[PDB]
Every structure is written in structure tokens, then in C-alpha cells.
Design a protein around this motif. Structure first.
Motif, PDB file in Angstrom:
ATOM      1  N   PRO A  29     -10.167   3.610  -2.763  1.00 29.05           N
ATOM      2  CA  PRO A  29     -10.504   1.688  -1.916  1.00 29.05           C
ATOM      3  C   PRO A  29     -11.297   2.405  -0.642  1.00 29.05           C
ATOM      4  N   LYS A  55      -9.377  -1.317   4.883  1.00 29.09           N
ATOM      5  CA  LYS A  55      -8.684  -3.149   5.218  1.00 29.09           C
ATOM      6  C   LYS A  55      -8.819  -3.186   6.731  1.00 29.09           C
ATOM      7  N   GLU A  73      -6.515  -6.763   7.586  1.00 26.99           N
ATOM      8  CA  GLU A  73      -6.344  -8.071   7.997  1.00 26.99           C
ATOM      9  C   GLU A  73      -5.104  -8.420   8.989  1.00 26.99           C
ATOM     10  N   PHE A 101      -6.923   5.171   2.940  1.00 23.38           N
ATOM     11  CA  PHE A 101      -7.060   5.531   1.751  1.00 23.38           C
ATOM     12  C   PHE A 101      -7.281   7.091   1.818  1.00 23.38           C
ATOM     13  N   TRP A 106       1.194  13.692  -3.115  1.00 23.07           N
ATOM     14  CA  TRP A 106       1.666  11.939  -3.283  1.00 23.07           C
ATOM     15  C   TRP A 106       0.691  11.621  -3.751  1.00 23.07           C
ATOM     16  N   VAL A 157      -2.891   8.625  -3.961  1.00 19.44           N
ATOM     17  CA  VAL A 157      -3.810   8.205  -3.240  1.00 19.44           C
ATOM     18  C   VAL A 157      -2.838   7.395  -2.493  1.00 19.44           C
ATOM     19  N   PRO A 186      -2.211   5.110   0.798  1.00 17.71           N
ATOM     20  CA  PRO A 186      -2.014   4.918   1.602  1.00 17.71           C
ATOM     21  C   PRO A 186      -1.767   4.417   3.260  1.00 17.71           C
ATOM     22  N   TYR A 227      12.320   3.669   1.428  1.00 16.05           N
ATOM     23  CA  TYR A 227      12.793   4.032   0.576  1.00 16.05           C
ATOM     24  C   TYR A 227      12.745   5.599  -0.105  1.00 16.05           C
ATOM     25  N   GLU A 275       4.986  -1.283   3.050  1.00 13.11           N
ATOM     26  CA  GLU A 275       4.500  -2.672   3.516  1.00 13.11           C
ATOM     27  C   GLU A 275       5.592  -3.240   4.089  1.00 13.11           C
ATOM     28  N   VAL A 276       4.606  -4.390   5.384  1.00 13.96           N
ATOM     29  CA  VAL A 276       5.495  -4.924   6.761  1.00 13.96           C
ATOM     30  C   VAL A 276       7.090  -5.767   5.922  1.00 13.96           C
ATOM     31  N   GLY A 277       7.585  -5.492   7.193  1.00 11.59           N
ATOM     32  CA  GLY A 277       8.987  -5.865   7.138  1.00 11.59           C
ATOM     33  C   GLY A 277      10.051  -6.526   8.178  1.00 11.59           C
ATOM     34  N   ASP A 278      10.923  -6.728   8.333  1.00  6.88           N
ATOM     35  CA  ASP A 278      11.668  -6.538   9.534  1.00  6.88           C
ATOM     36  C   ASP A 278      12.091  -5.539  10.049  1.00  6.88           C
ATOM     37  N   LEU A 303      16.983   1.026   6.806  1.00  5.12           N
ATOM     38  CA  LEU A 303      16.959   1.392   5.587  1.00  5.12           C
ATOM     39  C   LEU A 303      16.231   2.896   5.791  1.00  5.12           C
TER      40      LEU A 303
END
Ligand SMILES: *C(=O)CCSC(=O)CC[S-]
Ligand SMILES: *C(=O)CCSC(=O)CC[S-]
Ligand SMILES: [Zn+2]
Ligand SMILES: [Zn+2]
Ligand SMILES: [Zn+2]
Ligand SMILES: [Zn+2]
Lengths: 217, 218
Positions: free
Chosen positions: A2, A5, A7, A19, A25, A27, A29, A160, A196-199, A205
Motif C-alpha cells: 500500500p 498515507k 492524514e 507499509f 508479521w 504486511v 503498517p 494488544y 490505530e490512534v487512541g487516548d 493497555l
């Protein structure tokens, strides 16, 4: 495969995604940032390749932003891939002393400017670098943006799963994650390298995965 | 590669998390709920696979709970992945009329029971489904748990970035987020499909993203 990007994440802050194939693991990102500081820009981690690094640099130069410098969070090629290209263009590159030593140890091109310690200002009051201690790698550092309350966790933030443990310090990771969480719980946004983005919850976590990670050893 | 996990989110309310690779997004985590109703339980969205679905269903039966029925927030497989298995094992599956129509268009096994309109009570006084209008997908709907002030946002709740826009309705999303914001601004906990749990503030964040989505698209 890919394409890169770019953003917009918040005022003066962009997230760039590249990527690349990663042994075991597939591909994967990679997320980095591009911080805007008065018509000038800074790269927080380089894309895996020199080509994407240039596309990124070029994308911002066309938007009116001169690339003032680049900072790599840790030595793995997904944060330092474009340092040879950047240095060839005389663009200031930075990495902790531990990072350059590891880069030299693995036959990689090193950042032109190093630094060490707990805190270091790439740019006063705008871009601060913090070292929580060993975790994902012995050298991993994070980047804090005071003005937007944004924290770039890099590959230290593993909410995770701990992922690639090839150079991880599983014994120290939980202590380092505890430190990072209490220091930046005020974060409005946390940007991981592979999630992905979070708080500020991504900090909790990560701590749990590390703890789990050591028990699990 | 990470295993399925079931964490208690509240009383009679659990959060099931499954993972899977998605081209362009890497290993994506997926949240769904499991609401309890008198030794019975309803599935809010299904894991990507039949296997995870099986492990999920079991964990609860194993705990002494009957699987009354299941509901999917939208057609993407991270919500309907286990409808085939749930039907096979003769378990009541629900999906919106638009959802089952999309599933049918995509050559996928539909949900036994459908339903249309703005509001629909899967369980009166306990489980309600709401359709804010096109957004992440033309069919996305949300689930409200009155007895707990908990709203399962689904893949429509994208507080830090819209994500996979393949089937998104960018023009309609901002108005739908507006509708959703007011309709459920009294939420104590908003559960996103791909982000961590939070509160009503996530409704505000989603709207802002949508708007930035439409402005950023023209
Ligand atoms: C987390 O480590 C997931 C694997 S991605 C990788 O190993 C590239 C260097 S961090
Ligand atoms: C949000 O869309 C993040 C990616 S998950 C995905 O695209 C498949 C399920 S909606
Ligand atoms: Zn790494
Ligand atoms: Zn990495
Ligand atoms: Zn979806
Ligand atoms: Zn989804």
C-alpha cells in the motif's frame, strides 16, 4: 505494498503511514508524525524506505513547509529507514545515543545528532522527547507535543500484544510502562506505531501487556 | 493472532474482543457486547470467524446461559462473521433490512430475522436498536442499553479518524452523527468497535471527524 498515507491528525500535526513486509508479521503498517512549527516541519520517525521518506518530504515542501529536522524513536528500520537519504540531503537527523550505538552495531547509517538522558527538547515548548526506559527495545523513546497534548508512543505502545520481542527487555518493560503512564496520563491522544490512534487508555493497555509479558515468561 | 478475550464491562454486560488482519490497517481489534437477560444472553455483533463465535457462545453457555439471539450492527464481516454458524446451530440472528439486503448483494449468509425503521426493540425495556442514518456504511445502526446507560457505538463511532472508507457515506455521516449525538448524549459509556470504551464525549469526537471528513473531501 500500500502507498504512503498522510492524514491530518490535529492542527500542525500529521500522521504518515508506510507499509512493509516484516518477518512473521506479514504486511505491517507504520505510523509516524510530521510536526509543523511555523512554516517549518519535523519528521517523527522515517517511513521504512528512502522512497517514502522523500515522497513525505516532498509532500510537505510543496505545501510550504521546509523540513527542519527528523527524529527517530528507536533503531529498528521502521523508524530509521530514511536516515541515509535525509543525511544525503543535509537534513538534520536525530536519535538517542543508545539508538546510534545500536544502529552502528547493526551496520546502519546513524543520525547526525544524538542526545541522551530522561528529557530532551528537539524544539523548546513544542517537541519534547522522553525516555521511559527499556521495553520494546533498549533505546526506545517517545515524543510529546505540549501544545496539542499529543504523545507519539512509537513501538513502545503495544496495547494488544508485545509484538516483535527480538530486542525487547521484558524484565524492564513493565517498570518503563508504569513510568510513561504516570507521566503522560494527561495525554489527549496517543499515537502507536502499529495500532490505530487512541487516548490515555492505550498507556494502561500497554502496561498490562508488559506485565502479562513478564509473568508469561 | 491475539486470542479472543471476554472482559466484564458492567453487570450483565461483557465486552468480547476478536482480532483479524485487514488490508491497509494491520491487525485490527474488534469489540462487541454480550448482554445478559435471566440466565439468557444476547450477542451484540459477532467475531470475524465462526470459530471465535463458537468459543464465545460456549464461554457463556459454559457459565449457565442460554443464547437467545444475536444482532449485527452492520454488514462488514467484523459484525456478521459468525451469522452462518449461529444459523447452523439454530440461534436467532437479527440484522437490519438494509443490512440483510447488502449481505445478499455480497453473496453472504443473511440473518434469519430482519427489521426496519428508526427504532426497534430487540428486547422491550431492555435492548434497543437505533438507526442514525448512513455513515461508516449505509446500514450501520447502534445499540442502546437503557438499564445501564450504555451505548454500543459499533464501527460508526470513529472518534480519532474515520478509518476504512470503502463503504462510507461521507456526506450523510456528519448529519447522522448530529442526530446520534443528541439522541444519546445521555450515555454513560460509549463502546466503539475499534477503539477503547469511553463516555458521551466520543459522540462529539465522531461528529467532528465526520465533518472534518466531508470538508476534507471537497
Ligand atoms: C510490534 O513489534 C509488531 C511487529 S512490527 C516490527 O517488528 C517492526 C519493528 S518494531
Ligand atoms: C475502521 O474502519 C478501522 C478499520 S476496521 C475495518 O475497516 C473493517 C471493519 S469496519
Ligand atoms: Zn521496533
Ligand atoms: Zn515498529
Ligand atoms: Zn465496517
Ligand atoms: Zn468495524
Amino acid at each position: 505494498l500500500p502507498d504512503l498515507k498522510i492524514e491530518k491528525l490535529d492542527e500542525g500535526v500529521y500522521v504518515h503511514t508506510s507499509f512493509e513486509e516484516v518477518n512473521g508479521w506479514g504486511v505491517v503498517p507504520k505510523h509516524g508524525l510530521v510536526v509543523l512549527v511555523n512554516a517549518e516541519a519535523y519528521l517523527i520517525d522515517t517511513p521504512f524506505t528512502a522512497k517514502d521518506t522523500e515522497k513525505l518530504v516532498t509532500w510537505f515542501v510543496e505545501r510550504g513547509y521546509k523540513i527542519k529536522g527528523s527524529i527517530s524513536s528507536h533503531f529498528h528500520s521502521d523508524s530509521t529507514g530514511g536516515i541515509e537519504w535525509l543525511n544525503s540531503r543535509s537534513i538534520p537527523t536525530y536519535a538517542s545515543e543508545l539508538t546510534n550505538e545500536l544502529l552502528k552495531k547493526d551496520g546502519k547509517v546513524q543520525a547526525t545528532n544524538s542526545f541522551s538522558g530522561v528529557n530532551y527538547w528537539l524544539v523548546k515548548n513544542k517537541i519534547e522527547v522522553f525516555y521511559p526506559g527499556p521495553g520494546h527495545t533498549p533505546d526506545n523513546v517517545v515524543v510529546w507535543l505540549p501544545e496539542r497534548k499529543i504523545l507519539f508512543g512509537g513501538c513502545f505502545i503495544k496495547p494488544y500484544g508485545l509484538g516483535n520481542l527480538g530486542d525487547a527487555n521484558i524484565e524492564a518493560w513493565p517498570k518503563s510502562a508504569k513510568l510513561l503512564k504516570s507521566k503522560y496520563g494527561k495525554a489527549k491522544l496517543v499515537v502507536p506505531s502499529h495500532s490505530e490512534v487512541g487516548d490515555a487508555s492505550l498507556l494502561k493497555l500497554t502496561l498490562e501487556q508488559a506485565v502479562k509479558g513478564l509473568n508469561e515468561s
